[model samples]
Every structure is written in C-alpha cells, then in structure tokens.
Target: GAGTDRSATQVVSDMRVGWNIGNSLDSFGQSYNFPYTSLNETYWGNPATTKALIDEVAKAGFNTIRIPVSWGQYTSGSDYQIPDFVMNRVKEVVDYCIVNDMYVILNSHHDINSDYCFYVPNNANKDRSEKYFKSIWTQIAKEFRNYDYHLVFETMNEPRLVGHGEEWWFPRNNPSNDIREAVACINDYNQVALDAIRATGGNNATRCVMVPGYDASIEGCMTDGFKMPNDTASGRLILSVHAYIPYYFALASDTYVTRFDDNLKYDIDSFFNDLNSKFLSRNIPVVVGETSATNRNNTAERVKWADYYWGRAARYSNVAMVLWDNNIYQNNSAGSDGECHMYIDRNSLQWKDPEIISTIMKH
Candidate 1:
C-alpha cells in the first residue's frame, strides 16, 4: 500500500520551502475552452507546465510545490462532475511533483470568483457554497485517496466576498457585521470539505488538508472570528494564508520603495509573530500558501527581502512558505511591474533571478 504515516504537523515541519505553479492549472479567462487543457492553461500567458519545469523547481531548493487549480470551471451538471480530462491532466501534473517526492499542495483556486459553482462566503450564498465544496472535495479526495501523505488538499483559495468592493482588503481594527457572518460561513465550508475528504477513508482519512481564513489574510486568520475546522484526525488541519508582504515593495503598482529596509523588516516580522502567538504557540501548523517580492529591476533588494521574509518564517518553526511564481516579468510585458512575481521561467526552464532563489534558501 502506498502510504505515509505523517500527520499535518510532521509533514509541514520537514516540507521546508515551497513554490506555486501560478496561473496555469488555476488560470481562467477561457473557461468556455474547456477539455482542451492547453488553451485554458496558456490563456494566462504562462507556458503549459512541463515535467521539465517541475524537475527544475524541485532542483532549485524547493521541497514542496503548490498546484493551485480551478476545478469548477472544468466541471459539468449540478453534481459539478469534474471531467475525466480535468482529472487526468491534474494527476499528470501531480505525478510530475510526486516522482521526486516533493510535497504537493493541490488546491481550489480562481473558481471562487470566476465560476458560478463556488461562491464567496456569505449568508445568502452559504447553501450553494457548502454544497459546492461538499461535491467538489468528495470527488477530489476520492481521486487522490491512494496517494501518499506528501499530497495535500487545500480546501479553498482566498475564500472571500469577491466583487464586493472590499476584495483585497479586510477590516483590521473593527470587524464588520457582514465580515463576521462571512468568516463564520468560511468555517462551515471548511468543515464540510474536511468531512467529505475524511469520509473517503483512504490515505485521505489521515491526509493533511489546508484551510484558509476569510481571504487567507494573516489578520483574517488571527481574528477570534476564525475558528479551526473540526477534523476526524487530530492536528491534521493546517492554517493556510497568502501574503505578498510589505505591500509597497512586493505588490504595489506605482512608484515603489524598491528596497528591503527597516519598515520592511517590521512588516515581515509582524505577521509571522502574530501567527506564532495565535496559532503556532497552540500547535496549529501554518503554510504561507502564496508569497513573493515582485521584480522591480532591483534583484539585490528583492534578494534581501526574500531572505528576511523566508528567514522569519524558518525561525517561526512549524511554519512552511511557498513563493508565488506566475512566470511574469518586465520583459514578459503581459503584466505590469507590480504583478510580476516571476521566478521559474518555464519557457527556458531557468530561474528568472537565481540569486534571489539562492538567497531564499540561504535562510
């Protein structure tokens, strides 16, 4: 039997640094072009992920890979039956990582806002979102039930009120009436997803699963509003959050600071410290499901940022992080400066910034 006795805590502790195959399997804008795997994958401007790319990523000091996938876009009927083509293609990608024994994070992405099936958490849409998660996760869990524990299932990606104007930002100091309801809804959906996976009763019975806070926001997870989902297996649920920390440098668009310095250090240290107190201290494992410093023609400073961002995480203990790589850069031109988190250039199968890559591992 293909098996791993490792629990979520054990898996994340040793998984070390991780990477996201962003905008590929998780890519949208061409949902009408389904079944043709290449069209949707390339719709977002990245190359179809080849095993060569996965091989190179693992070789570049990453022990874990996050394959963010938009499964609902490829499904059919009320049951949300994911097509054979979708499953087959995703498994092929999963195989690419697992062959090297890299820990793989298979997730539900983009469909939260892009598709009709999965809804952003709220009172009115709760039933449909719950139903969608139950159906989608049941199928997902069963399909990969036989795989080893290295393969993890992330219940959702940034599950929030999409298109509600406050999409990217969450209320930090004062929680809203609507926000409290939404956070409660997210907890329910996560619970539904967990019960579905455990019901399958294979390696999934004890497999690690990642659950997000309101929008996978650090503060969202830190809030008393966020409650850990109950699990059949003890300590099997991991907290998942995404951060392109120090907004001015990592993700902001206009005139950027472009340096990793004192304020940058405070911003980087703040969230990890919060996670350590809120979750890590209580033995709740954490994964920064997506993170990166965008390319600003300042490789040296970005290198400094990566070391600090990943370094703080390494010191935080039981915390694992993945760099967000969309294969976008200045020369690529599809995205502006702020959007480029390019690390692995799939076209040539090389690191866009090898020094930044090494500096991250240097932590």
Candidate 2:
C-alpha cells in the first residue's frame, strides 16, 4: 500500500498479462426487462461471476483483470445518474479482484450502444454525448475515489460508429469528412472523461487511466485522429487498443487457418514492432487490452501463437495484453462463429486451454 501514486508506465508494466470478464457485466439485452437482472451478468449465457472464479484466474497466473461494465443502461436519462445499487453491484465484483491483489481495469463496456446510449460523438449529438460521458465518469470516479491505484479506470471500450460501413477497419488517412469528424469527437469525449475522473479528487487524481482510440483500433491510435487526452496526472494515461492481430489467424477469416509457424511470427513481429515504434519506443505505455485466437480445433497452432505473442510482449516490455474470454468454448465444427476463445471454464473450474495458458504464463 504505497498510497497508489506511481507513473502510468509503471502501472502498465505491473499489469503484465490480463483477462477480461467478458459477456458478463458487459452483456446487454436487446430489450430492457424490469429489474434488469435477467439482462445483466448471466444474460449473455455466462454464469454469475463468483469469488471462486476470480480466485482461480489470479491463481492461474493472471495478475490483472478488466471489468468492462455498461453503466449507461442502468443510468437515468440525460442526468445520467447511475443507481446506487448498480454502483454497489459493480463495486461488489471489483472488490473481489481487489481482495485478490490484482490490478483491476474498470472500463465503459457496452455504452457505445449506437443510439440508445453514448454514441460515437459527432456533430449530430456532440453536446448530448459529452454530457453522458462526463456524467457517467464523474459518478464512477466519485464512487471509487477512495480505492488505491490497484483500481484503474478506462474511458470506453471500442468507441466507434457501430453501424458505419467502415466500423471495423477504418481508413487511416483521407477518409470521408463524416468519419473523420467522429474521430475528433472521440478525442473530446476522452478528455471529458479524464477530466471527470480526476476532478473527483482522492486517489483518482493520480490514478492510472486508460483511453482508447476509434474502435480501439491499432491503426486508429497510430493515426493522427486518436490523441491521448491530456490528463491531470502526468504520464498517467496509457494508450489502450484491442487488436486481434493479423486478422486472418487470430480472428476467423476466409480460411480458418490453423498454423502459427515461423512465417506467422512475421505478422506477430510486425504487430508488436509497429506498436513499439508508435508508443513503446517513445516510452509511452501501451496495452493490447483484448486479444485472443479462436479455438479453430487447432490447439497446437493456437498455442504457438500464444508463445510468440506473449514472448514478444516480454521482449518488447511496457506492452500489456489481456485475453478476451466470452465463456463460449465450444469448437467450430464446420461452422464459423469466431467466439471459441474460452480459456478457463467457470462451471467446472477447468483450464480449458492449459497448454496455451502455460505458454502465456511463461512471459
């Protein structure tokens, strides 16, 4: 308990490897039922997270956990007043990780629900969006202000225009004016959230905060559009991006290719090298907040990917990576759903991919 005051880079380095409690707190129902419990944690088919689950994860060598929550759904209209119970519930889960002595990243998960909630800020809804951004973050910061730096705050998940044609792979340069303006709004939104968090005082003033670019895309952050918001705390803003490296392998592509040999290492090298040049080379902290290769019924190949991926993080240093587990471990038997990256089974307490996890833990 050194009083939660440290340079942002140090916090990033301490994070090392991370795991996302995906599809739970972040899960949202298409329709909001009364009480919302039916649409909350287990709504997405994942079991209610328990202390045993968190303990198993930390015991399995993951020292960091990202708790992505969609605070917008539980909040009042424009006032954005999140209920006390909602806050308590999230804090309840957060405290579990805190007790485990792991770094916790509390981020705005599904808030970017296109139109209902915090939409990608644009000329159309810039003022309203900014209000939501500041309101929600201010409440969150106030609630968790007393906690030490063991708790970290991330602005948003993947801020992007959901239904836009170029949502996933946005053109870096020379895009349409509409798309570019939204990118600008994202920077402004980030600044608003950062301001709100620090304004709450206490440990929040020096808290290690994370801010992502458009869609949390690698190219998005590299481009001039995604500027790291100016923070009250010096060097306390880590550039957050979620990339399923090279696309073809980590994510399902035309051929559910099952190979991570030397050739594929080039792609891995390219990803980490480019990231290093962009931020790590400059000593700016960078974290691949969410990444995972699908099951593909190819454990050996996927295991190799983990070895090289985590190995590069260790070699490069200052680069943190977190696995995105949605609890969907079923294999793709001639079907292409792309969500087979389940690491640990919560129900049976099984390390589904023990070999792959072993490779990751080595780093």
Candidate 3:
C-alpha cells in the first residue's frame, strides 16, 4: 500500500498531544569539542535511548514524538555532510516510532557552531547560513525520502540571531539589526529548507514540513515582519511555535507566583486565538512545538497550565501541543540554569511523576 495519504490537517488532527525527546540528540553542552557519537545524546545525564524508551512514551498516551537532533556535531567542513553512523542511529530511533504506528517530527536541533547557534539569522551570515541550512535539510530529506506519512520534517529548532539583545524582546522602532532582518533571514532559511526538501522528490515532494518562526516565539512571529514560507506542495507546510506561556508563571525562578493566573489565561487565550486567525483559519496548521513548565516542584500548577493549554488547542482545528520532557523530574531538580527537569527515568523507562503524565494525557 502507498503510505503517503494523509494531508497535514489530517496529521495534526490525529496528533492529540505530543512529547519531545529533549536534551538527547540536541545536547551540545560540553563545548564544541566532544565526539558526536553516543556522547552527544548521553551528555546531558540521560541514559542512551533505546527502542523501549520511546515505547514507554507511546504507551503513556503520546501519539506523536518530536526527535530533536543536532547534526552540526556530526558534520564538518563546507559541505556539512552528516556522517553515516549519526544518520543511521537517528534512522534507527525513527524506525522505532514508525514501528509503533506513531507520528514523528525530526529536525536539525542544537547545531550551534561559531557562526550560528540558536541565532542563525542576520545580514552578516545569510549567505553561509543558507548554504549550511539547505545542506542539512538536503541530506535529511534524502535519508528519509521514502519514509511513510508518519514521518515529518521540521526545518530548525528556534532560529534566532544570538548575542543580539533584542532576541528575547522585539526591537521598538528600528526592528532592523535585531528584529526585522532576523525575521527576514529566518524566512529565507525556512524557504531554503522547504525548497531543498522538495527538490528531493518521492515522498518528500508532498511531505508535511514544519518551519520555525523567528526565535520560535508565539508573540514574535505574530508581528508584521514574520512571513510564512510559500510551499509548492499545498497544505503541507506547518508553523512551529514554542510557548512557555506567561514566562513568569511557567519558568521564572525569581517570580513567586505558583498558580495559573487570569493574566496568564488572557495571554494564553490571545496567543492561540491569534494563531488560529493568522494561520489555522488559512488552512495552515500550527504546532506548539516546544512547551512545558520546568519541574520546579510545581506539579499542581503545571497540571493546571497543561489543562488549559491543551484544552484550548483542541478548539482549533489545525493545532497540536507537544510537551518538552528532558528526563529531569522533581527530585532531580534542574541545574542552576533551570533546564527542563520533568524526569522520565531512562533506565526504568517510566515517568517520575505519573500524575503529571496522567494530567497531560487526561487533557
């Protein structure tokens, strides 16, 4: 049977909720010198991923898995060709998902180099950046070209121009150096990726591809400067956004608030509503690609936020919410930087907080 049958809308419709395998393939913490083999994925203190690990996620009610990979560590020189071992390992993990009948979205993750990291958008780096970005996707598209519709390709993880002060907040008027041009460059990056993948033909010709907004922030992308890429394959392009909504309540260690407040409710509602009107209403699907409150001993409040966030997303016809789990649960407590700590025991293959998982699934 020919497998490429579902449209992007149908794919999103089937994905009620999603989970992210964070800090694994995306781990680039130990400087840029570490070897890219098992070191990259296991560097962040999680055990090496096995098929059973992902199997546990599926059994826990996640229909979709977002595998974040950093290809930069594995490739070098001008061409940026990913090594066979690295690609094969990723393909193995992807096959695990496909065998379980789960939908998976794979993309270039923390591929931070001296020239680019989270910040890959700027006038100074557009030429080399486009070539680098396109090369990554070209190889990726060719690798999984014939995979079933269950597999999807996402261009990048949060394209931004690091070191620019405005990365966190938008520039007021100029929007030039740090805002406007960054948005434009990210659009160019996405366009390059879309064209590169489509150029591969076969299943990729009409494959569902996801593009990230500038910084992958909801509010930032809604601004006038952000432009969604035009796709030759209709209804197959998705907008990716990351929301740790009401940052104070969700991730701010300094903020004392513990509950989801009315202010947060307003912001959350407005954000999703804007997404609907701007993209969903236009037949373009949107994915809350990376979202989760850090496990800072706030399970109750975290549950409340998930309920509202996932419930609200269900109202939109073309929206999917995926939680970011980096295998650091409550007792684990994140590093001083406060990275994600919702622990799923890589060894036991179980969630540290069953209630937390249950609450999200219940929603």
Candidate 4:
C-alpha cells in the first residue's frame, strides 16, 4: 500500500529509506546446524523482543520493515499453515510498525532449491510446495486482508541452490524450468489467495502487492528474464529484490583480502545504474529490499558504496532501497575502532551516525 496517490514521477522522485529485519522466526536459508525451530524461535518467538525491534526500526528513519518468514517448517506437510503463535508474533511486530506509520513486507523467506532446494526432490515435492504456498497466503490474506495499503507481500525470498554451481532446487537440474515453475506457481497462488481475501470484502481489496523476482537477486531484478503475472485490478504491484554489491565486501568481511576497498565503488555505481535503467525503461518500481556492506574494516568503503550507489538511484524514480545491518559484525571487532555499524545505537536508541554511513542515509 506504500504506492498510493503519488504520481509516477513523485514515487520515483525521492528514495524511500528501508531495512531488512533478518532472522525473524527463520533465517534466510533455513538450513540450521542446530534444530531449525530452536534458532528461529530464539529470535521471533518472543513477541515483545520483535515488537521492540520494530519500534527501534521506526525510530531509526526506516519507513518499511521486510519480515521474512519461512512457512515450510511451521506447516504440516507443506500445507503452509503458519502456526497461530508464529502468525500472531508476526502480527504483533507488524502492528507496532503500523501504529508508527511504517510499511511492512512479508514474503516466503527460504524455499526452492533447484540447487539449494535440490534436496527437496521433484514433482511430489513441487506439488507439496505449491500447496503450501497457496495455503499460507490464504491464511495470511484472511488475517490481514482488512488492513490498509501500508503492508506489502513479497512472494518469495532468495530462490537459489546449495553449491556454488548447483542451480536446480534438488532432483531437477532444470534451473530454467525451476524458476519458471516457481514464478508461475506464485502467480497462480497469489491470484487464488488475494481474490479470496478481496471477496471477504474490505480495505484488503485495494492493498498493493510486491512480487519478488527469482533469487531475489539483482539479476532477477534486472533483465535476467523474470516477471510476475499481470495483476487483476488493484493497479498496485511493485518489483522486489535484494542487492549485496561486491558480496565480498558486504558479507565475507572475515576474509582479510576480501575486505571493503575503494575500487568497488565504480562497480557499485554501474550495478545500480544498470538496474535503475531496467526499472525505468519498464515504468515499474524497483525495491532493493536488502543491501549492506560490512561495518568492518574500512567502514569508509562500505559507506562509500552506499552513498554512491544510492545517490545513483536518486537520479531515477520508483527506486527505494533498504539496509541489512547484521550488527557491524567482524572478525576483529574488539581489536579496533568499533564493534558495530551503529547508525542508531540499538541499546540507547540514539544515533551513532558513522560518517560514510550517515552520508548514505542523508542522501
């Protein structure tokens, strides 16, 4: 519903600040070394804990919170019925944001393993997956269908594989077929669930929906040949994808040689420009649902990437981005300048305002 009344020009004019609140009731990739439920419940089970976190996000200049949830674990044989407790916990956090006037995005967190999902087998698994997908949305629609447009639905999380080169979700080596089937299934599933909700009759019929491209990656966001099925009539559909430019810089900070560097700036700019061009050319809005660089060594480079890439997005319309702050994590946090990327200190709710980082937000 964030896409209201704003003219196309206005929507794309200024970038909307956002953040990805990860590991909520489920880690992105549900492959837990320990028991999966134990890990997810640790973060999301405590309703107050998540509620407080959402309160903090609203305080930290974020207009949206992307709550990623995995229904597979909670459902019965992929029936996708999220446990009432889990759903209630999610609702609590979402309501907190709503009270403060923030947009909320919920999506199928981690599913499909043409490679990562490779372990899931074939037709039988695929059928189960589709059923689960539809069932989950049915309940979700029934629950929040009456809510306003501030909330959005992201179809799926990063749909990928296990090994570096494994592309299929498991028994299927057909990456193309896998992605195609996944998209189609989501499209069909959304129509069914969304229509049912609308039929229930209320503000729910007008809420906008966010469709995630394959992998929720930039390639999917751009021209890797992926799209959502046409909408019925809500006239509100936004494309969603996550961007982690120079992954080595953003995620693999533990590797010394892979730490953030200035040279990555140019590459970063090109990536966003290329993506922005694609979105603009299509007259569709693009939401970089998640992106972040290490609050690690040379935090300056992290800030630089954010500022430059984000500034480039500012040159266009309908491009809103979010940061995935995993807490300024690093191998040597205690040895140096600081331990976290505290734009706003989580404990005191005060702004730490690191220079390069602050510059990105201000832009």
- Show the lowest summed lDDT stretch of 10 residues, model 1: 30-39
Model 2 Cα lDDT, one tens digit per residue, 1-363? 555688877888788789999899998755354225323777788898899999999999999999989877767656778888788889999999999889999999998675455656577888988898889899999999888877889999888777778777667776567668878988999999899998988888899888888888876787776788887677788889898864667787456566666877887787777778878888788878899997777788888888888887797657889999988777657534477778999788788879998999988
Task: Score each candidate by Cα lDDT.
Answer: 0.84, 0.82, 0.78, 0.57
Candidate 4: global Cα-lDDT?
0.57
The estimated TM-scores of all candidates read 0.95, 0.95, 0.92, 0.77
Q: What tens digits encode model 4's per-residue C-alpha lDDT throughout 1-363?
A: 433433333432343777665544444334343213433634432222355666776665677777776656555433545667767877876787778777777776665432134113234455654455557766777688756667776656665433434342222223466555554554454455455445444555555666664456665545344545565544456767676667656655344333446677766777767766776566777777777665555655665667777787776667788776443343464223322333444445544445654676676
Give per-model CA RMSD: 2.2, 1.8, 2.6, 5.3
Candidate 2 worst ten-residue window by lDDT:
30-39
The parts of candidate 4 lying over 4 Å away from their true place are 1-15, 28-39, 43-52, 111-124, 167-201, 253-262, 333-353
> What is the C-alpha lDDT profile of model 1 across 1-363, one tens digit per residue?
557578778988988899999989887754465434333777788888898989899898898999989887777688888888788888999999999889999989988663443666788988888888999999999889999989999999998777666566766656687778888998999999989999999788899899998889986898787988998797888999988889888887766667778777998788888888888988889999999888878889888888888777877668999989888877323223688888977899867889988988887
The parts of candidate 1 lying over 4 Å away from their true place are 30-39, 114-117, 331-336
> At residue 149, what lDDT does model 1 achieve?
84
Candidate 3 lDDT (Cα, whole model)?
Answer: 0.78
